[PDB]
Design a protein around this ligand. Structure first.
Ligand SMILES: [Zn+2]
Ligand SMILES: [Zn+2]
Lengths: 115, 114
DNA sequence: GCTCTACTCATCA
DNA sequence: GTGATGACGTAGAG
């Protein structure tokens, strides 16, 4: 019977992380390691990792979970990504965590300059 | 015996202008009146009339004729619009021809002031 | 801490 | 005189 990849103890995996994100990770371990397993909105992915719509809209590149938009079901559905996937992608895109920092620096100098 | 709306004489209408653009206009009169009847590419519509992709892509709004892209059939199809439709939309959007020149004006000042 | 689309230009197609 | 899409962004309206 397969064990959770963090704790190596649990055999009941988080249904979302397992079914949607293909991760053999229990619910308690997901909460204990948000740096790998937290679900991020589309908007959070753009803000946090500077990924673009084309990257995030690409069905081949990321797993994702859709939910009704929490402001209204008539609005476009919310889209949730798993941190470890979007982070891996962004580290490749920008040159590691330091890469991302660099890009953080640059955009804020812009917004400073633009005032 | 239905007649061209420009010349009131010809009965044989330009097949593109009639079939595609719903205009009861002969080929000769289409050539004699490019201010109404010329076909303009999607690119020319953006450059000439400051129409945007959303406007030009809206199938409800304009009639259009597609053709293979002249640079290569593997590229996106060429899209042709008729002047009188594009222009009327643009005049509506920008406030007349003067409106359009004002916007022409505004944009060149950008390229200068950049 | 919601998301899509719309508002100059290059490039590749 | 070819066209779609993607970029330093950001506000609306959904
Ligand atoms: Zn576990
Ligand atoms: Zn005629």
């Amino acid at each position: 019977a397969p064990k959770c990849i963090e704790c190596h103890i649990n055999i009941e995996m988080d249904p979302v992380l397992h079914d949607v994100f293909k991760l053999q990770v229990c619910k308690q371990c997901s909460k204990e390691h948000p740096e790998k397993y937290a679900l991020l909105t589309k908007t959070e992915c753009k803000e946090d990792y500077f990924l673009t719509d084309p990257e995030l809209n690409d069905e081949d590149l990321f797993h994702r979970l859709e939910k009704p938009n929490p402001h209204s079901g008539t609005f476009a559905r919310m889209q949730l990504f798993v941190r470890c996937e979007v982070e891996a992608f962004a580290f490749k895109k920008w040159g590691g965590e330091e890469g991302l920092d660099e890009e953080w620096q640059r955009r804020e100098e812009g917004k400073a300059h633009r005032r």
